[PDB]
Amino acid sequence: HAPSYRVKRMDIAKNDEECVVNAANPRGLPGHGVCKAVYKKWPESFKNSATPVGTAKTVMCGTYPVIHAVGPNFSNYSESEGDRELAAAYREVAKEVTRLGVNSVAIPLLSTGVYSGGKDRLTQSLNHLFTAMDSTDADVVIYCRDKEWEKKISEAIQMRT
């Protein structure tokens, strides 16, 4: 086992990893985008999944862990406070991945969809992902949907190797 990062452009509900990170909202609602796809595939994981901004809460669907990570909605937060909460959400993901003992995890880029406040946050969100996950030994598979984002994420992964 050599821990790795990979990126795939496809629906995270089809992931091939041992657990999934949901781009969750604080109230545990079905939501939109990635969150709604996670709700359709693992609805049982939404039982008592509500948790504050900047935190993560894991709920099992059977034995399959869904890590509900709540990034900030940048429409509501200032750039400085939102940046702090986004970094914090990813730190909580790293703790949960470690506690669960999984060999791999499927992760989306938090706060880059409807919580982005209308801005391109690929680099900001990806760099906070790396800051949290670099010290873990899980294989990390990042899921995206946009063709140009796939290329940019792949370039960012490859240039550190």
Binding-site sequence positions for ADP-D-ribose? 11, 25, 33, 113-115
- Footprint of Cl ion on 6-35 (CB under 5 A): 10-11, 25
- Footprint of Ca ion on 53-72 (CB under 5 A): 53-54
Q: Give the count of residues interacting with Ca ion (CB under 5 A).
A: 2
Q: Which stretch binds Cl ion (CB under 5 A): 38-46, 48-56, 85-93, 115-123?
A: 115-123
Binds 83: which of Ca ion, Cl ion, none (CB < 5-8 Å by kind): none
Closest approach, Cβ 147 to Cl ion, in A, equals 9
Which positions make up the binding site? 11, 25, 33, 113-115
- Footprint of Cl ion on 128-147 (CB under 5 A): 139, 144-146
Binding mask 129-158 for Ca ion (x = CB under 5 A): ------------------------------
Closest approach, Cβ 107 to Cl ion, in A, equals 12
> Is there binding between residue 117 and Cl ion (CB under 5 A)?
no
For the chain, the DSSP string reads: ----EEEEES-GGG--SS-EEEE--TT----STHHHHHHHH-GGGGTT----TT-EEEEEETTEEEEEE----TTTS-HHHHHHHHHHHHHHHHHHHHHHT-SEEEEE-TTSSTTSTTS--HHHHHHHHHHHHTT--SEEEEEE--HHHHHHHHHHHHHH-
Alpha carbons 43 and 150: distance in angstroms, whole number:
27
Q: Which stretch binds Ca ion (CB under 5 A): 3-11, 13-21, 51-59, 60-68?
A: 51-59
Asked if residues 139 and 4 have their Cβ atoms less than 8 Å apart, the reply is yes
Strand 20-23 with 64-69, pairing: parallel
Residues in touch with Ca ion (CB under 5 A):
53-54
